[PDB]
Design a protein around this ligand. Structure first.
Ligand code: CLA
Ligand code: CLA
Ligand code: CLA
Ligand code: CLA
Ligand code: CLA
Ligand code: CLA
Ligand code: CLA
Ligand SMILES: CCCCCCCCCCCCCCCC(=O)OC[C@H](COP(=O)(O)OC[C@@H](O)CO)OC(=O)CCCCCCCCCCCCCCC
Ligand SMILES: CC1=C(/C=C/C(C)=C/C=C/C(C)=C/C=C/C=C(C)/C=C/C=C(C)/C=C/C2=C(C)CCCC2(C)C)C(C)(C)CCC1
Ligand SMILES: CC1=C(/C=C/C(C)=C/C=C/C(C)=C\C=C\C=C(C)\C=C\C=C(C)\C=C\C2=C(C)CCCC2(C)C)C(C)(C)CCC1
Ligand SMILES: CC1=C(C/C=C(\C)CCC[C@H](C)CCC[C@H](C)CCCC(C)C)C(=O)c2ccccc2C1=O
Ligand code: SF4
Ligand code: SF4
Lengths: 74, 31, 61, 135, 141, 742, 30, 80, 43
């Protein structure tokens, strides 16, 4: 989604699963066109990954599984 | 797959601490 | 060195290392640090005297 | 072996804890010329008896501290004993009956370095060895 | 010089500030007299005098002249201070003369402190300014 | 034996010799400086008279002479305040228009642009607005012109002169012997009967003859010039009769017990004068008369020279019971042989009294046009709370100093003091627990609330609209005090304070005082006060009870009151001394009182102070935001500190700019303190070594060898700058805020 | 987003460095 | 326990021994100084590491040194 | 002599400093009273 409009869409870091949240808080953290409560990413990883040619969640996923195996090798 | 959050967050929150603190407590008090 | 001789200290752990002191007395015996040297300025403990060996002193006067 | 009656008003919450039963305990004995008030190691004004007094104490420092106070009462016959849970009483101060500040023949030099403190080796020299720089 | 600097007498922001200039002292013209003086300075966009401290002679008043005047007064104070310390060290009760000033010694030194640059050069070119490193106490290495 | 005047003649010859001999008073300091530590020690030991000489008589004389010195400087100060009132104020303008004109008695000189601080304070006058309440004091005194202040100021300078002479005379010329000083029964008799009793009778006199008439006419809207001078009410009785008919009866009703004949000028009205919003002068008159009688009676208790009376020693010795062994036996000797035991007591109870005064003066504003002067109200409350808190910590310090220096085991064996030492582990362990319990069940409720509000769960909060914690006991006491007039105080018309209940009383447009309703926010903040007081006491009590010894250091009394530690051994013994407990208690006293004055400031602005519509609707200064905001830390940060700091931070280019500068200056001094508190001597001495090397290199090495401050001085300097910076910040904050909104 | 299967593969692949991290940690303790 | 080493710069003033709150130190015969006695540390198991002995020592630099080592019940000064 | 004792007291560090810094402050305050607002030396 962020690829299509990088200047207006907010990058999501990860999902929030917190039992302690009330409904107002869940509503408050439901942002950046997410279905549930999420944290906006401020690490600039989206910008970085987009610049270096990644365009799909499948590519990001394949990157993550490779890095597990690369961590495993070390 | 979202249901995994309902499993993992409680495990990392309770099961892992209890298991880790229980073991480390028994290890530091072992004579 | 003898009584009244101004001496510079060569002991590196001495508060007065490379400072001038006056020889108060030299104990005529076989003790390792016979020369009692008084100083104008006190150390961190507030003492102004200390025993030194002749090799730890340079007579300046 | 420890003779002496417990001083009057010797009671306080600053006395022996479970350590005295489990690890080790100390006693300090002294002969007083007269019954007189003295401050206990851990607070409270106790009363010495005329004659042999026995005070149980948690730490040897209590004994040495009280000893210092007994010296102000012109009393120098105080003896400190370490007592183990097996009831193994050991006379520990003054070690050889003479007070350590007074010189006594028979005592050997312990942990004496035949050098000035400036002449210790560098930590780099004794690195990966058992010995320290003050050995 | 740079960053939207104009002469203060040309900057509209300055003139706007000058018209509402607050009187510093009892003198009721002190507010206007300030902006009359500051007109010769370089002003930023907001109309505050910016000082140029690069050693430009046309801006010598900004930092260069204050610098010379400070170094002359500070050097006086330091020299007079040093002079007195060296004077009392030749006496017996030197420590007492530190906390309780010998005005007999101090005031003549203070008076002759105007000529400190000459005294500083003379003492620099006599090896009488510094002590030898071998004769100064240091820590074990 | 008999109390009598017995002095030594010419004990100390007067000469400037010793003025030229700094540190003459201490044998160690007399030898002179070798290091810069000497210069600090000089000031540190200057007034520690017990270390000067062993002789208790010589110490007693020094203390008696020093007190005349301190009375002289306080009289110079009070004379200065009144003089500045007479010469450099808008007092006369403020009398003519109390509600509109702003009190000011400090005019700044026009230099480097600081004349901006001379703001428009009303009465065609430019100066710094004063918050000391001097104008309300002088109005209460019945002072109506600048000449009366000039007379009072000069009178003060003469009294300050007399106090200086007294101090010189009673030290250098006619110094009382120790016998004199130890007449505690005679001193209590004279101080209860003359100082307090006759002072209160005297003042009742002034109130009845001068203040009440002059204030009554001013409240009737009579012009200040038209009001008769205070002596005209004595010389011309007719004028006084017109205001108070009871004076027609003369002095016969007093002697014949027909006291109802004075019911018009000796009242028990209660509440506040509706014109001024202060207490009734006639109530204040009767108070001071009643006080005077009770004091003059009270000060005939102690036996002096005529057998009749109590001996305090016998009273103390007789008060013992089955829990307390010998009871109060030996305490008379403690309090008559140790000045530190008396200073401990007097600082503890004067400090406690000053806090009572703070509370009683806001709730029952005793001066005319005080209640509506919200700037004065806030400032005098905060001021007297601070003085109170410092004095209490001083009490604890000097209690610990007594325990280390002046405590005798022989005098104090199996008495209340001895027996508290013997269960000090039980005292401190229980006080430790109640501190943790109060901490969790007071502060933890704020953390609960912050978290619930943050998680969008206001229904789960501790609040009036959620889980309520109503202070039912304080609510019940408020009701009893509100029902008192006509009921359990039949001859009272109004309650003692409108804070307890009754109506909103309003003077001008503004609320003088109204009922201070207590809810969950008031329950929570009261249990924060309980917490922060119990922790301060834990520190200070631990300081006093473990000053002489502990399970860690048996011979702590030998190390003294003020020593940095007994070395890194036993795990480390940093700050074991009674001095170091005072050091730590000061931070907790500061923390405690900060929340007290913040509580007062916000609660008064949200729930009490504000404007009153013609209809009678009260619009508060912060619109009753306390109930919902003061139940979270975020609410304190946002609605109190952030919100009310707007005035101090936006003060530059105005008459309040000084408070903006003080605010930053104080933030700086506070932060500077952290250098001293967080660091240690070792680092600074090693840095000084290198700096000394450079001074040696250029032959400017001082004869008085530079030293890093002592470990204790490091801490003393730390806590000094911390308290100065912290308190000064709040001072600048409070002023800038309340001089804008209040 | 990524499928439930892909998430389950990642978890199973993550057991590999999980196991090897344990083996390294135990070996480093010796 | 802590280690307390004595150095040959000792003048046998006895001040360290007198200072010690747990009788670690004692004076023993010696020919090295005029006082004809040197400080010794036979009972370092009783040393709490207070460094009162170092504060007492009048020599420059110190002739007695405490090197804080393994902490025990006695060295930690615990009555429990 | 009592004069000598006063002079010694006046010449003591804190009194000497007070007199000297009061004179220094006095000089600076008066210069700024008669010549205010000197941000730089005019040319
Ligand atoms: C890090 C992960 C974590 C997770 C996943 C939770 C989850 C929860 N906490 Mg939180 N909590 C945590 C950390 C965590 N906590 C920490 C660190 C603190 C201290 C700051 C708290 C302080 C806290 C308080 C004060 C409270 C909670 C409560 C809750 C529950 C609220 C949900 C609800 O309303 O249903 C209702 C849910 C229940 C009534 C409980 C469901 C069954 C429980 C979880 C276990 C049943 C037994 C289990 C099978 C076996 C033994 C337990 C354990 C060994 C696994 C929820 C289970 C609230 C609660 O309900 O407490 C019980 C509550 O009052 N928590
Ligand atoms: C005669 C007095 C005098 C002189 C000539 C110097 C000279 C120097 N100081 Mg020293 N210094 C002094 C007094 C003096 N100092 C005093 C009283 C203190 C305590 C505050 C210091 C604390 C100090 C520190 C912490 C440092 C220096 C450093 C230095 C060197 C760099 C310049 C500087 O940093 O100024 C620093 C100036 C101050 C800290 C304020 C000085 C205070 C007053 C104005 C000086 C005293 C005047 C005296 C009362 C006059 C009496 C004269 C009368 C009797 C006739 C330079 C050699 C630095 C250095 O080591 O550089 C290599 C350095 O880091 N000084
Ligand atoms: C006790 C505390 C006290 C304090 C803090 C002040 C403070 C002040 N006084 Mg006040 N004053 C006081 C007592 C006090 N006074 C007393 C007892 C009298 C009666 C003699 C006066 C009579 C007085 C007069 C007549 C004046 C002041 C002035 C001042 C202000 C300037 C000070 C000054 O002139 O420095 C000068 C510096 C030195 C003396 C040292 C060099 C300052 C706010 C002045 C003022 O307010 O100007 C508008 C002013 O003209 N005072
Ligand atoms: C009537 C009140 C009173 C009296 C008569 C005394 C008397 C004494 N006190 Mg006690 N004390 C008091 C109140 C009092 N104190 C209070 C309220 C506290 C709590 C802070 C203490 C806490 C206390 C401690 C911790 C100690 C004493 C000690 C002493 C003794 C020596 C004091 C000395 O030499 O100061 C010399 C004066 C100074 C070093 C200067 C003090 C300046 C302070 C720190 C800051 C002032 C800032 C000011 C408010 C704002 C201006 C700032 C501006 C200048 C920048 C002396 C018997 C000492 C003692 O050993 O007893 C035997 C001691 O260690 N007192
Ligand atoms: C915010 C700063 C801060 C805090 C939180 C503390 C906290 C404490 N101080 Mg300290 N103190 C401070 C600053 C602080 N201090 C400073 C700056 C100084 C230097 C002067 C001191 C000097 C000092 C002294 C001299 C003393 C204290 C004491 C105390 C304790 C008082 C008892 C209590 O209330 O326990 C209750 C605990 C709290 C109020 C802390 C917060 C509790 C939270 C809200 C609840 C727990 C939440 C949750 C379960 C966390 C764990 C879960 C997680 C692991 C998943 C308390 C632990 C005193 C003491 O120990 O006596 C008992 C004591 O005598 N302090
Ligand atoms: C310490 C240095 C110092 C110096 C160099 C001056 C210098 C001056 N003063 Mg100032 N003065 C000072 C301190 C100083 N003053 C202090 C501390 C005060 C407060 C008591 C004053 C109060 C004062 C007044 C009231 C007046 C002066 C005036 C003057 C000027 C005229 C002559 C005179 O001395 O009177 C002269 C420029 C006079 C002047 O010319 O002003 C118009 C004048 O009327 N001074
Ligand atoms: C730390 C560095 C610093 C520096 C470089 C300055 C510099 C200046 N300040 Mg500032 N100031 C400072 C800190 C500093 N200040 C601080 C900390 C404060 C708060 C207290 C102030 C508050 C302040 C105010 C309120 C004012 C100044 C003013 C001044 C200016 C003129 C001062 C003067 O007396 O005229 C020059 C004086 C002379 C030429 C007389 C010296 C004659 C000598 C003795 C002759 C010797 C013979 C050779 C000057 C630009 C004034 C100004 O005009 O602002 C622009 C002014 O009104 N300052
Ligand atoms: C609180 C009631 C109170 O003070 O009880 C009173 C009681 C003292 O009773 P006594 O009859 O012995 O008091 C006699 C004298 O001390 C009073 O003159 O105190 C104690 O038992 C010790 C304090 C324990 C307090 C624990 C908290
Ligand atoms: C403010 C001020 C001031 C002033 C003050 C004053 C002015 C005061 C006064 C005071 C007074 C003016 C007082 C008085 C008082 C009195 C009294 C206290 C009395 C008493 C009496 C009696 C007690 C009586 C008795 C009797 C008789 C005789 C007979 C018959 C019976 C009878 C019993 C009734 C000054 C300047 C210092 C300054 C500062 C401030
Ligand atoms: C031109 C200019 C500039 C620049 C400058 C510079 C860059 C400089 C350099 C300089 C330098 C690079 C220097 C150095 C030096 C060194 C040394 C080595 C020194 C020493 C000194 C001394 C030794 C002194 C002494 C003294 C005196 C003289 C007096 C007082 C006392 C005393 C003793 C302190 C500027 C832009 C800023 C501004 C404009 C102009
Ligand atoms: C900064 C700091 C120092 C260094 C500070 C020192 C040594 C204080 C020195 C400052 C004074 C102001 C020096 C005054 C020197 C002269 C008297 C000034 C003469 C000039 C005037 C007349 C103008 C310590 O010594 C220290 C010790 C223990 C714990 C913490 C700290 C700590 O934090
Ligand atoms: S750190 Fe400082 S206070 Fe603590 S033991 Fe060491 S010297 Fe003493
Ligand atoms: S070690 Fe130091 S204090 Fe101890 S006897 Fe030797 S010189 Fe004296």
């Amino acid at each position: 989604q962020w690829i299509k409009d990088p200047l207006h869409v907010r990058p999501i870091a990860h999902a929030i699963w917190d039992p302690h949240f009330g409904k107002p808080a869940i509503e408050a953290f439901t942002q950046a066109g997410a279905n549930g409560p999420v944290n906006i990413a401020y690490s600039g990883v989206y910008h970085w990954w987009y610049t270096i040619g990644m365009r799909t969640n499948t590519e990001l996923y394949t990157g993550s599984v490779f890095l597990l195996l690369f961590a495993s090798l070390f | 797959a979202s249901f995994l959050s309902s499993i993992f967050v409680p495990v990392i929150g309770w099961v892992v601490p209890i298991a880790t603190f229980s073991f480390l407590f028994l290890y530091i008090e072992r004579e | 060195v003898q009584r009244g001789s101004k001496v510079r200290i060569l002991r590196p752990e001495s508060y007065w290392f490379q400072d001038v002191g006056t020889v108060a007395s030299v104990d005529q015996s076989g003790i390792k640090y016979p020369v009692i040297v008084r100083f104008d300025k006190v150390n961190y403990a507030g003492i102004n005297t200390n025993n030194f060996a002749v090799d730890e002193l340079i007579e300046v006067e | 072996t420890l003779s002496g009656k417990t001083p009057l008003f010797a009671g306080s919450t600053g006395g022996l804890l479970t350590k005295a039963v489990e690890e080790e305990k100390y006693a300090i004995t002294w002969t007083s010329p007269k019954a007189q008030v003295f401050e206990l190691p851990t607070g409270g004004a106790a009363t010495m008896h005329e004659g042999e007094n026995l005070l149980y104490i948690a730490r040897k420092e209590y004994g040495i501290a009280l000893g210092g106070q007994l010296r102000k009462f012109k009393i120098t016959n105080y003896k400190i004993y370490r007592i183990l849970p097996s009831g193994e009483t050991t006379f520990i101060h003054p070690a050889d009956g003479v007070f350590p500040e007074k010189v006594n023949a028979g005592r050997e030099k312990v942990r004496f370095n035949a050098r000035s403190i400036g002449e210790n080796p560098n930590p780099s020299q004794v690195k990966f060895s058992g010995k320290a720089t003050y050995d | 010089l740079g960053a939207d600097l104009t002469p203060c007498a040309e900057n509209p922001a300055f003139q706007a500030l000058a018209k509402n200039a607050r009187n510093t002292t009892a003198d009721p013209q002190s507010g206007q007299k300030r902006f009359e003086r500051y007109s010769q300075a370089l002003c930023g966009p907001e109309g505050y005098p910016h000082l140029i401290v690069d050693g430009r002679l046309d801006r010598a008043g900004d930092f260069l002249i204050p610098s010379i005047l400070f170094l002359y007064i500070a050097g006086w104070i330091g020299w007079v201070g040093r002079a007195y310390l060296q004077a009392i060290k030749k006496d017996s009760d030197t420590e007492q003369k530190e906390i309780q000033l010998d005005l007999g010694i101090a005031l003549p030194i203070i008076a002759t402190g105007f000529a400190w640059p000459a005294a500083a050069v003379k003492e620099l070119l006599s090896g009488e300014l510094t002590a030898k490193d071998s004769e100064i106490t240091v820590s074990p290495r | 034996k008999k109390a009598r005047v017995i002095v030594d003649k010419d004990p100390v010859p007067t000469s400037f010799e010793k003025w030229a001999q700094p540190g003459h008073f201490d044998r160690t300091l007399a030898r002179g400086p070798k290091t810069t530590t000497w210069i600090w020690n000089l000031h540190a030991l200057a007034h520690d008279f017990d270390t000067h000489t062993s002789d208790l008589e010589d110490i007693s004389r020094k203390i008696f002479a020093a007190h005349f010195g301190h009375l002289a400087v306080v009289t110079i100060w009070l004379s200065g305040m009144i003089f500045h009132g007479a010469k450099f104020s808008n007092y006369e303008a403020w009398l003519s228009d109390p509600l509109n004109v702003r009190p000011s008695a400090q005019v700044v000189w026009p230099i480097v642009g600081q004349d901006i601080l001379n703001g428009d304070v009303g009465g065609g006058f430019h100066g710094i607005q004063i918050t000391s309440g001097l104008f309300q004091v002088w109005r209460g005194w019945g002072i109506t012109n600048s000449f009366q202040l000039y007379c009072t100021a000069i009178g003060g300078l003469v009294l300050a002169g007399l106090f200086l002479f007294a101090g010189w005379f009673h030290y250098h010329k006619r110094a009382p012997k120790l016998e004199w000083f130890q007449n505690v029964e005679s001193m209590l008799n004279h101080h209860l009967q003359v100082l307090l009793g006759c002072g209160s009778l005297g003042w009742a006199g002034h109130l009845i003859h001068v203040s009440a008439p002059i204030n009554k006419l001013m409240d009737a809207g009579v012009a200040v010039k038209d009001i008769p001078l205070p002596h005209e009410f004595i010389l011309n009785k007719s004028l006084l009769i017109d205001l108070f008919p009871g004076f027609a009866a003369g002095l016969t009703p007093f002697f014949t017990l027909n006291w109802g004949q004075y019911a018009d000028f000796l009242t028990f009205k209660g509440g506040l004068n509706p014109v001024t919003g202060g207490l009734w002068m006639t109530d204040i008159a009767h108070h001071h008369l009643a006080i005077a009688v009770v004091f003059i009676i009270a000060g005939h208790q102690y036996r002096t020279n005529w057998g009749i009376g109590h001996s305090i020693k016998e009273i103390l010795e007789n008060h013992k019971g089955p829990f307390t062994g010998e009871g109060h036996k030996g305490l008379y000797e403690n309090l008559t042989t140790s000045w530190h035991a008396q200073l401990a007591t007097n600082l503890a109870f004067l400090g406690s009294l000053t806090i009572i005064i703070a509370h009683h003066m806001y709730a029952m504003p005793p001066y005319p046009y005080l209640a509506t002067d919200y700037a004065t109200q806030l400032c005098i409350f905060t001021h007297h709370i601070w003085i109170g808190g410092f004095l209490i910590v001083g009490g604890a310090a000097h209690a610990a100093i007594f325990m280390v220096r002046d405590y005798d085991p022989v005098v104090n064996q199996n008495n209340v003091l001895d027996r508290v030492i013997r269960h000090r582990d039980a005292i401190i362990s229980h006080l430790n627990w109640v501190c943790i319990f109060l901490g969790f069940h007071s502060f933890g409720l704020y953390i609960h609330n912050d978290t619930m509000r943050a998680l969008g769960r206001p229904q789960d909060m501790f609040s009036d609209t959620a889980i309520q914690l109503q202070p039912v006991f304080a609510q019940w006491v408020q009701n009893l005090h509100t029902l008192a007039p006509g009921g359990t105080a039949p001859n009272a018309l109004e309650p003692v304070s409108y804070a307890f209940g009754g109506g909103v009383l309003a003077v001008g447009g503004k609320v003088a005082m109204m009922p201070i309703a207590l809810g969950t926010a008031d329950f929570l903040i009261h249990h924060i006060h309980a917490f922060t007081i119990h922790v301060t006491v834990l520190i200070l009590l631990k300081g006093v009870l473990f000053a002489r010894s502990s399970r860690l250091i048996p011979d702590k009394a030998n190390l003294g009151f003020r020593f940095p530690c007994d070395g890194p051994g036993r795990g480390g013994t940093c700050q074991v001394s009674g001095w170091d407990h005072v050091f730590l208690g000061l931070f907790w006293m500061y923390n405690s009182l900060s929340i007290v004055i913040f509580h007062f400031s916000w609660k008064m602005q949200s729930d009490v102070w504000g404007t009153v519509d013609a209809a009678g609707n009260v619009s508060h200064i912060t619109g009753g935001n306390f109930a919902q905001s003061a139940i979270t830390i975020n609410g304190w940060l946002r609605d109190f500190l952030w919100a009310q700091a707007s005035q101090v931070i936006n003060s530059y280019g105005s008459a309040l700019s000084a408070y903006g500068l003080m605010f930053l200056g104080a933030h700086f001094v506070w932060a500077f303190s952290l250098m001293f508190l967080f660091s240690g001597r070792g680092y600074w001495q090693e840095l000084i070594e290198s700096i000394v090397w450079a001074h040696n290199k250029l032959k400017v090495a001082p004869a008085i060898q530079p030293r890093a401050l002592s470990i204790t001085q490091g801490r003393a300097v730390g806590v000094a700058h911390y308290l100065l910076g912290g308190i000064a910040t709040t001072w600048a904050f409070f002023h800038a805020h309340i001089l804008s909104v209040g | 987003s990524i499928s439930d299967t892909q998430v389950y593969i990642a978890l199973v692949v993550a057991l590999i460095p999980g196991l090897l991290a344990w083996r390294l940690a135990t070996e480093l303790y010796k | 326990s802590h280690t307390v080493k004595i150095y040959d710069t000792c003048i046998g003033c006895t001040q360290c021994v007198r200072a010690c709150p747990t009788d670690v130190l004692e004076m023993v015969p010696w020919d090295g100084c005029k006082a004809a006695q040197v400080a010794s540390s036979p009972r370092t198991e009783d040393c709490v590491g207070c460094k009162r002995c170092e504060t007492a020592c009048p020599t420059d630099f110190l002739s007695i040194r405490v090197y804080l080592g393994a902490e025990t019940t006695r060295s930690m000064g615990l009555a429990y | 002599d009592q004069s000598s004792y006063l002079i010694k007291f006046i010449s003591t560090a804190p009194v000497a400093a007070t007199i000297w810094l009061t004179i220094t402050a006095g000089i600076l305050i008066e210069f700024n009273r008669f010549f205010p607002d000197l941000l730089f030396h005019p040319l």
